[PDB]
């Protein structure tokens with residue numbers, strides 16, 4: 086048993102990380118088949134970033150202005166184009182290590198693994214949630230741009246995130262692999278407002294189920310509630326509303342533990358109203374909302390890839 | 391910026407995970423060169439585990455009762471041997487994906503990445519610390535035995551842990567890659583006791599520096615304390631005593647932040663006595679002790695592999 090924040094094995098993704106340099110700027114790129122994906126701000130100077138005109142900046146670049154290195158292998162760039170906020174660099178060689186993959190745009194509250202990279206070389210792997218305000222609270226240093234987030238299903242890598250920037254608040258923003266930002270953000274160096282962040286209620290409930298499965302039961306109470314009553318309390322504590330679809334998703338966990346979803350909501354409403362009183366749940370003194378229902382089931386079933 | 395529990399990229403190790411089956415039991419093995427290492431308890435039936443005589447049990451087996459499978463491919467065992475608590479199966483094929491590797495026995499307080507595996511297939515990756523009582527708090531289900539723990543140094547994989555068993559308390563124990571258990575544990579299904587688990591004091595201090603580097607500074611104060619005075623308070627709270635070697639290890643973080651080690655100990659002293667008063671530190675309401683000073687520096691300077 087046990088329960089940890091757990092990343093997907095990163096091997097299939099390591100094999101796609103390459104280094105992309107343009108003029109003075111270097112960052113990471115993702116090489117799938119014969120195309121290298123990377124953030125378009127690779128074509129900017131530091132002074133450009135204050136207010137970039139991306140199509141005028143890209144006008145000035147030819148194919149040979151793009152240095153793409155895969156390990157020590159130099160890739161020949163034979164085409165370039167901009168799609169929203171990512172550059173696509175057509176290269177003359179298909180990545181022989183390309184996994185089966187898809188590009189997908191996740192929903193707020195869903196989780197993914199981040200393979201942090203620098204100069205095209207993997208540095209570490211960790212799990213992240215897309216917050217309700219479409220930021221992520223990661224660990225990215227200068228040069229980490231182009232690092233990607235992904236989920237794996239057996240042998241298929243679903244790429245869902247490419248890293249573009251750290252906001253002045255110190256949280257992180259990026260795009261899907263078609264270059265569309267998550268949230269209202271743009272790739273310009275200006276202060277930009279992320280919305281009010283909120284707690285991912287369905288994830289908290291899933292984590293409470295993980296706790297019961299692992300023996301932590303002190304928070305189980307003798308009350309119950311309704312979806313509407315609970316949602317009134319959810320709103321008061323800046324928690325995402327809970328929907329019927331969320332109840333349905335929590336179905337398998339409720340069947341395993343014998344605890345009906347609305348009975349777990351009554352437990353949570355009590356932890357919200359009375360606090361945790363210095364007690365812990367699965368080694369944490371705060372309510373944890375970065376495990377989805379699928380993450381919990383994965384880690385209490387043993388799915389492999 | 392940001393600070394996360396970050397594992398090493400697991401690619402080099404994924405290519406070494408095989409499935410080992412000895413009659414009834416299946417678990418994971420580690421295929422390096424022409425040897426597959428795995429827990430010796432694979433040769434036990436269920437009832438065998440209550441009181442196994444491993445030498446007599448190994449006699450009843452010869453090279454062909456061991457089914458090693460890599461992906462779909464099956465390997466030919468051509469030699470077997472028992473080094474302490476690990477089996478060594480000689481195969482007729484050197485692993486072409488063998489990375490540069492060392493076998494290493496680590497010290498309590500040090501960390502590593504676990505690649506959790508089932509039926510020889512990687513399932514997830516996460517970071518652990520060898521607790522002072524020589525257990526680890528991992529996430530392991532039946533069939534996870536044989537999963538390994540490791541660190542990476544550029545291109546060389548230092549294997550330090552192989553998983554064997556969950557104790558009745560739900561924490562985990564295992565060996566080095568020479569088969570020597572960490573701690574007082576034995577690979578027999580009898581009630582076993584881990585000692586008192588203390589907090590890794592030098593790791594907590596390292597994480598407070600990580601916190602200052604990332605802008606969480608509220609807990610700071612320019613109170614002083616002697617190493618000796620600090621340990622008197624530490625020992626009351628089940629903190630490991632802080633030695634001078636620990637102060638030396640914390641040197642580089644002291645210099646980057648301009649906060650002397652003993653000044654930080656003074657801040658920890660005040661956090662232990664007066665609690666955190668509902669504030670948080672790096673998104674956590676407890677003091678974290680599973681980051682070494684080396685982990686902090688690596689994540690705050692972007693070491694790549």
Ligand SMILES: O=C(Cn1nnc2ccccc21)N(Cc1ccsc1)c1ccc(-c2c[nH]cn2)cc1
Nearest residue numbers: 110129130131225226227249250251272273274391
């Ligand atoms: O935020 C970034 C890039 N970035 N991403 N993760 C980071 C972690 C630590 C430091 C910087 C980080 N910026 C600032 C910015 C940009 C748009 S909105 C905010 C950044 C800084 C420099 C450059 C650049 C382009 N060409 C040369 N330098 C790009 C982004």
Ligand SMILES: O=C(Cn1nnc2ccccc21)N(Cc1ccsc1)c1ccc(-c2c[nH]cn2)cc1
Nearest residue numbers: 086415434435436530531532554555556577578579
């Ligand atoms: O702990 C284990 C096996 N194990 N390891 N991590 C686990 C996580 C969840 C459930 C079981 C887990 N034991 C008990 C034990 C006591 C001393 S050493 C191992 C275990 C149970 C069965 C068997 C076995 C071997 N052959 C057939 N059954 C081995 C170990």
